[PDB]
Design a protein around this ligand. Structure first.
Ligand SMILES: Nc1nc2c(ncn2[C@H]2C[C@H](O)[C@@H](COP(=O)(O)NP(=O)(O)OP(=O)(O)O)O2)c(=O)[nH]1
Ligand SMILES: [Mg+2]
Ligand SMILES: [Mg+2]
Ligand SMILES: [Mg+2]
Ligand SMILES: [Mg+2]
Ligand SMILES: [Mg+2]
Ligand SMILES: [Mn+2]
Length: 756
DNA sequence: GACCACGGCCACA
DNA sequence: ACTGTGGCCGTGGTC
């Protein structure tokens, strides 16, 4: 099983390393035969003698094109003759690529920025994370002496914790008497001891929570300020720091550092992403939080240091428990994209698609197009029409079916061969014309994009089937992961075609796909209402909610299944409508915002405040109860009563201040803000105290009783002391709770005055 | 000062 | 930095 690839330089020559794990043994395979290269498309196929001769300087050394070779590749759907330029070392390419492009005889260069170790995986056709090898994992967390003001790592690492299949342990230098704590003399002997552990257990995966930006760098600064060699690598190296955008990421050679923090946020939608919040939201059981003010006082006084030890052990224990959960899915993404788990676990959706496309492009001998430069990125800033959304027949509906298309956009690309390489091709024999936008797509040869999506959706439907044969719950989950992933990947391949900075950008392709989707959806809605007597209650991009006005449950289901047979026989090719559920009742407030309950009482809510992370809990909790009494028993009087009980709890300050916290994330640097809302205003006064306010941090503020702007009486929640503060009951009554339930109960005649 | 468009955030598909 | 569609609120201009 391949884990990762990199390269070293032996006497100026690149040497690929492949970090494998086979038969429970860690092996390092070397390849000294791979040559770096990129492509060049010249004006004449004869000037290459001059192109052989361009040189450049790197590090007191002239860089030269080693060898050249005539290649025929597929570019723009037609075979073009391209020139392959071989080099000695990968770092030669950036030092010479511009000197080549600037040559008049060459029009442009291609595939000049693909990293060596990743090109190896693509060209050599290798796929990491495949096989049945069980990787040895080990989590770790630390505890630190913090004071306000002192620079990063000014103080010491008080304790280090770790956890695996043998349990969790703690290592510190102050004497803490507990069965899972190991005491040593000093910090050195602690960090040195922790190194002895990792080297001894030899884990393939090092699991952390935010180790990319804290744990490893703290262990770095002390190790130098103290004089230890952090030989965590299996080659005897130290943790290697990279630059993942504004923030950083940490690699551990020979192993996979799995920072759960990027994985969690990108996967789960939580108002806060603390360890205690993430743990309790994934496993249901809560987790205690000891703060930095406590562990510093507990250290300098020596009092209640055992409480710090429990938290330290808990941190390591829970991150391991979380790592065992989220890693196997991240492994499937690695196999699907064809890049290391370390890379795909922190990659944006766009970059994951490009890597998938680049591998696909290499398999089909498709010369990859460059990324756009400034002028092209300026052009590609347009917009195009997307999915159709109807205005919901606002109110309460009964006996509803939801009919939806199977992968509507990827099925359109497949059915109509939508691809940049099939758009407006001359000499076409069979073409398909896009509605509204009139773009013609050649069907003589299968397009690049349709051929990949076809293989993906074919593999998706293969997985949704074999899953049923398999019995082991793990294989069910593992396989199910690939099923959902293929879908996100497929839709992102569509989104790639409209992406400003995408290599296979094609606005015509992108807007043709949506144009067909509008036609197929509105056609289906036309048929079901005219040829079958339905009334479409609400419809988003790929499906709709409909019912027979009046009628009975089965009558709605029977005619719905009849309509499906009629419409799926009239639907061209890979296009298909499916029965995706019956629902006893359903409330449709507005576009993107509705709630629905099935036959068994499962309430599904979409878009409403109850699901939005930037609303107070007291607002969600009561809208949930109002929706419940509305869809569970239709008890409108109990629903209107509930609003009256909670509104009196607020005015009498009986509701816990924790339920009135609004969580909103800042998205940019505070100088770049043009509108200071309450959450930004709070984050600006925090920057006046010198706190880390970076893009991505969540502001959690409560509004205090007072007058003026909201941003003048909003304080962070960790700053709220109930004895000294009183929250603004009037604000949360008139601006949070009542507005959220009135938009629902307005359909029943009730107004806010009737709810206070 | 009452009225209103609009950053800005997060959600749906 | 995958796409477009969309609801919603505090906040400042505006006559
Ligand atoms: N670029 C981009 N387009 C998207 C995304 N999500 C949806 N689209 C568009 C493109 C998608 O083709 C369309 C609908 O996507 P589904 O409803 O998630 N497909 P399913 O197989 O689940 O249908 P059914 O419900 O019957 O199982 O929304 C996205 O995240 N990114
Ligand atoms: Mg890597
Ligand atoms: Mg290229
Ligand atoms: Mg769909
Ligand atoms: Mg689906
Ligand atoms: Mg759908
Ligand atoms: Mn865009």
């Amino acid at each position: 099983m391949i884990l990762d690839t990199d390269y070293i330089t032996e006497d100026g020559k690149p040497v690929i390393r492949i970090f494998k794990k086979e038969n429970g043994e860690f092996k390092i395979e070397y390849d000294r035969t791979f040559e770096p290269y990129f492509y060049a498309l010249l004006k004449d196929d004869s000037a290459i003698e001059e192109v052989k001769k361009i040189t450049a300087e790197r590090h007191g050394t002239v860089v030269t094109v080693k060898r050249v070779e005539k290649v025929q590749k597929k570019f723009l759907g037609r075979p073009v003759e391209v020139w392959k330029l071989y080099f000695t070392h990968p770092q030669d390419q950036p030092a010479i690529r511009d000197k080549i492009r600037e040559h008049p005889a060459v029009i442009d260069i291609y595939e000049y920025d693909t990293p060596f170790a990743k090109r190896y995986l693509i060209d050599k056709g290798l796929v990491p994370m495949e096989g049945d090898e069980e990787l040895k994992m080990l989590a770790f967390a630390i505890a630190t002496l913090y004071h306000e003001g002192e620079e990063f790592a000014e103080g010491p690492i008080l304790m280090i914790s770790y956890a695996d299949e043998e349990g969790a342990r703690v290592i510190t230098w102050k004497n803490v008497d507990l069965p899972y704590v190991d005491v040593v003399s000093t910090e050195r002997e602690m960090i040195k001891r922790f190194l002895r552990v990792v080297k001894e257990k030899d884990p393939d995966v090092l699991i952390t929570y935010n180790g990319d930006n804290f744990d490893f760098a703290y262990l770095k600064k002390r190790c130098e300020k103290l004089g230890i060699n952090f030989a965590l690598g299996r080659d005897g190296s130290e943790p290697k720091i990279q630059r993942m955008g504004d923030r950083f990421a940490v690699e551990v050679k020979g192993r996979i550092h799995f920072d759960l923090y990027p994985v969690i946020r990108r996967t789960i939608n939580l108002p806060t992403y603390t360890l205690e919040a993430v743990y309790e939201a994934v496993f249901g059981q809560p987790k205690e939080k000891v703060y930095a003010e406590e562990i510093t006082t507990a250290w300098e006084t020596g009092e209640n240091l055992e409480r710090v030890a429990r938290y330290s052990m808990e941190d390591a224990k829970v991150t391991y428990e979380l790592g065992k959960e989220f890693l196997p899915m991240e492994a499937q993404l690695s196999r699907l994209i064809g890049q290391s788990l370390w890379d795909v676990s922190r990659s944006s959706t766009g970059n994951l698609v490009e890597w998938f496309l680049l591998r696909k492009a290499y398999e089909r001998n498709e010369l990859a197009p460059n990324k756009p430069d400034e002028k092209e990125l300026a052009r590609r800033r347009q917009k195009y029409e997307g999915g159709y959304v109807k205005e919901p027949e606002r109110g309460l509906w009964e006996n509803i079916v939801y009919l939806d298309f199977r992968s509507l956009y990827p099925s359109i690309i497949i059915t109509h061969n939508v691809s940049p390489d099939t758009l407006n091709r001359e000499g076409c024999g069979e073409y398909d014309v896009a509605p509204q936008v009139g773009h013609r797509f050649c069907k003589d040869l299968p397009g690049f994009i349709p051929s990949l999506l076809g293989d993906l959706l074919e593999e998706r439907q293969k997985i949704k089937k074999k899953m049923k044969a398999t019995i082991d719950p793990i294989e069910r989950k593992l396989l199910d992961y690939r099923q959902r992933l293929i879908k996100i990947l497929a839709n992102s391949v569509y989104g790639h075609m409209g992406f400003e900075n995408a290599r296979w950008y094609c606005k015509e392709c992108a807007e043709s796909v949506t144009a067909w989707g509008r036609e197929y959806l509105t056609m289906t809605i036309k048929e079901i209402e005219e040829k079958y007597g339905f009334k479409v209650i609400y419809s988003d991009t790929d499906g709709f909610f409909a019912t027979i006005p009046g009628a009975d449950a089965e009558t709605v289901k029977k005619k719905a299944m009849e309509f499906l047979k009629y419409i799926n026989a009239k639907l061209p090719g890979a296009l298909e409508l499916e029965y995706e559920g019956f629902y006893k009742r359903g409330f449709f407030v507005t576009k993107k915002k509705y709630a629905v309950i099935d036959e068994e009482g499962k309430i599904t809510t979409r878009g409403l405040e109850i699901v939005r992370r930037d609303w107070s809990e007291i607002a969600k909790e009561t809208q949930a109860r109002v929706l419940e009494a509305l869809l569970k028993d239709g008890d409108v009087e109990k629903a209107v009563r509930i609003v009256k009980e909670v509104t009196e709890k607020l005015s009498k300050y009986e509701v816990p201040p924790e339920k009135l916290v609004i969580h909103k994330q800042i998205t940019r640097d505070l100088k770049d803000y043009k509108a200071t809302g309450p959450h930004v205003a709070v984050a600006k006064r925090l920057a006046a105290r010198g706190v880390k306010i970076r893009p991505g941090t969540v502001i959690s503020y409560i509004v205090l009783k007072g007058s003026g702007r909201i941003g003048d009486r909003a304080i962070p929640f960790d700053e709220f002391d109930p004895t000294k503060h009183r929250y603004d009951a009037e604000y949360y009554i008139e601006k949070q709770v009542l507005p959220a339930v009135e938009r629902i109960l307005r359909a029943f005649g009730y107004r806010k005055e009737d709810l206070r």
